[PDB]
C-alpha cells in the first residue's frame, strides 16, 4: 500500500537540442547520489508537494530517481479522479486493474527535474544542484516517463536499462528508508490550477507519440501500467 515512483530524469544517450537542459555525466557525478529527501511536486507548481524522493542516482543510462508518493490529500484526490475517469478505469493488458496507478499514468506520466543551470555545474555551484522532481504531463527531456507501483523492486525491475547491480544498489537504499519518518507533504493547491495544467496538456504537440517513444528510450519492460 506504499505508492512508489521510479524513472529517469535524464537519459544520457538522447541528443539534447537545448543547452540549458544538458547534464554532463562527467560533472553530475560530483553531486550524486542524493539520498536526503527532495520534494516531489506537480508541474513545478507551488503548494503541490505530494511526496519525497528516496534517492537520485547516477547510472550508466542516465540519472535515475526513486520516490514515494505519500500525501493523503493527494492520494484521496487521485482515487476520486480514478473513479470518474474512463482511461484510468479501463482494462490494462495483462495486469490486474489498479485505478490509482492508471490515473497517475494518464494525468502525470512524465518526470521533470528542477536543477541548477548547467553553466553553474562547471563551476562551484551557488546552492544545491538538485532542487525537486515534478510529476508532469510530459517531460522536456526525453525518456523521462514514470513508472508507478506499489512494489519498489517491481518498479525498478521495469527498467531494462538499469543493470542487476545498479538495481540492487538502488533498492538497498530504498529499503533502508522508513516512509513513516518522512514529513507530511504540503498539498494545498486549488484544483483549478491543476485542471488548467491538465487542459493545457491536451495541446502539447505530439504528446502521445513522445510518451510512446519515451518508453522506448527508457527501455521499460512490458507489462506496465503506462498508457502510451
Amino acid at each position: 500500500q506504499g505508492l512508489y515512483v521510479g524513472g529517469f530524469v535524464d537519459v544520457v544517450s538522447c541528443p539534447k537540442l537545448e543547452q540549458e537542459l544538458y547534464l554532463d555525466p562527467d560533472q553530475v557525478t560530483d553531486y550524486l547520489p542524493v539520498t536526503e529527501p527532495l520534494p516531489i511536486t506537480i508541474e513545478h507548481l507551488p503548494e503541490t508537494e505530494v511526496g519525497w524522493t528516496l534517492g537520485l542516482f547516477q547510472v550508466s543510462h542516465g540519472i535515475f530517481c526513486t520516490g514515494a508518493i505519500t500525501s493523503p490529500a493527494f492520494l484521496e484526490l487521485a482515487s476520486r479522479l480514478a473513479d470518474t475517469s474512463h482511461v484510468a478505469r479501463a482494462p490494462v493488458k495483462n495486469l490486474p486493474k489498479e485505478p490509482l496507478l492508471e490515473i497517475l499514468h494518464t494525468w502525470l506520466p512524465g518526470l521533470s527535474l528542477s536543477s541548477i543551470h548547467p553553466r553553474e555545474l562547471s563551476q562551484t555551484p551557488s546552492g544545491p544542484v538538485f532542487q525537486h522532481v515534478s510529476l508532469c504531463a510530459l517531460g522536456r527531456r526525453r525518456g523521462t516517463v514514470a513508472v508507478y507501483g506499489h512494489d519498489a523492486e517491481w518498479v525498478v525491475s521495469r527498467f531494462s536499462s538499469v543493470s542487476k547491480s545498479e538495481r540492487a544498489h538502488i533498492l538497498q537504499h530504498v529499503s533502508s528508508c522508513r516512509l513513516e519518518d518522512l514529513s507530511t507533504p504540503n498539498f494545498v493547491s486549488p484544483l483549478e490550477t491543476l485542471m488548467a495544467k491538465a487542459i493545457d496538456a491536451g495541446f502539447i504537440r505530439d504528446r502521445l507519440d513522445l510518451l510512446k517513444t519515451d518508453r522506448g528510450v527508457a527501455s521499460i519492460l512490458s507489462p506496465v501500467y503506462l498508457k502510451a
Binding site: 540549458e20 537542459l21 513545478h44 521533470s112 527535474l113 528542477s114 536543477s115 541548477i116 543551470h117 548547467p118 553553474e120 555551484p125 551557488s126 546552492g127 532542487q131 515534478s134 508532469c136 517531460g139 522536456r140 527531456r141
Partner: peptide, 6 residues
C-alpha cells in the same frame, strides 16, 4: 541561483 525546470 537560477534553476532550470524540465
Amino acid at each position: 541561483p537560477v534553476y532550470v525546470q524540465x
